[PDB]
């Protein structure tokens, strides 16, 4: 849809903490980022969903 809608989840957490938009046409590979989510209290890569 020109710009799909993507959620990001922690690994131990598994909490839909971060949400962001992308161009799926030019990025068919899933998005990887290192970030922070509060409750487990430390940085940790977030996955796509």
21 binds RNA, rule: CB under 7 A: yes
Among 11, 12, 30, 35, binds RNA (CB under 7 A): 35
33 binds RNA, rule: CB under 7 A: yes
42 binds RNA, rule: CB under 7 A: yes
**CA–CA distance, 12 with 15 (Å, rounded to integer):** 9
The radius of gyration computed from the CA coordinates of the chain, to the nearest angstrom, equals: 11
Nearest to 40 by CA among 4, 15, 3, 5: 15
CB of 4 to Zn ion, least distance (A): 23
Number of residues that bind Zn ion (CB under 5 A): 4
């Amino acid at each position: 849809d020109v710009r799909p809608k993507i959620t990001l989840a922690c690994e131990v957490c598994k909490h839909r903490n971060y949400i962001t938009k992308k161009n799926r046409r030019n990025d068919p590979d899933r998005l990887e980022i290192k970030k922070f989510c509060p409750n487990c209290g430390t940085h940790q890569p977030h996955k796509e969903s």
